[PDB]
Ligand binder design. Sequence first.
Ligand code: NI
Length: 45
Amino acid sequence: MQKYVCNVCGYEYDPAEHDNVPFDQLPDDWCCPVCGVSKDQFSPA
Ligand code: NI
């Protein structure tokens, strides 16, 4: 499934580590656990 990376802190969202929930299905207000930015600051990787 599609991995996403934080444009500020490079935190990797790997769906394998998040219950195989796709990034686009995470609640809208989900934030980067490191730098606190919103999902719109993530790029596919
Ligand atoms: Ni971040």
